[PDB]
């Protein structure tokens, strides 16, 4: 899974 914000 990858991060969900910049």
């Amino acid at each position, epitope marked *: 899974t*990858s*991060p*969900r*914000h*910049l």
Partner: antibody
Amino acid sequence: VQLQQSGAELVQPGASVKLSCTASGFNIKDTSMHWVRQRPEQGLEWIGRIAPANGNTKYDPKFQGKATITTDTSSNTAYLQLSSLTSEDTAVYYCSGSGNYDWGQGTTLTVSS
Amino acid sequence: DIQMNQSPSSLSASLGDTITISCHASQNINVWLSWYQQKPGNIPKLLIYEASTLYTGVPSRFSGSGSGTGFTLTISSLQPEDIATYYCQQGQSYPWTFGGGTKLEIKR
């Protein structure tokens, strides 16, 4: 940790550009790279992203086909290619990574004759 | 896609007040919502992610809360350094979408 983006570009209508952003502080293969733009005096538009260790890519419907996101893992940079540039596409294009990293400095693209 | 309805678009309030910007979601996005601050005129900086998890370096007067489809960014003790436009961003599914933005002005 910082991202540097290519200089402000001037390009003719209907042409194509390839914007870049290099990373110094982390590895490109270690996170996802995202592009967002901001038209003058407007909000934020999310363009797309490229998965770490390429890796698939995802895009926004209004940039589907007219935008391709790629990375040069050796150079530790990321690219955004835009085609059929119209006067609507003049904006400030930000490049950033997933996580707590800062955003790119920003590249202003101007589409004009 | 998932649309973020940020409100108000512009808000003016006196120094020291408490501010609440709200961001309603068209679908359920759980807690995958973030907040950004863009002072005039530089790059957007992350304030809050995961609806409520503060980011190191952001003043304590910023707080976030919400789940599902309702979210609120709270700014207590309004300081002049908070003059900026604020955006909410969801990351539950692609394409990621931002809110319309909230222009915050000080009523001196």
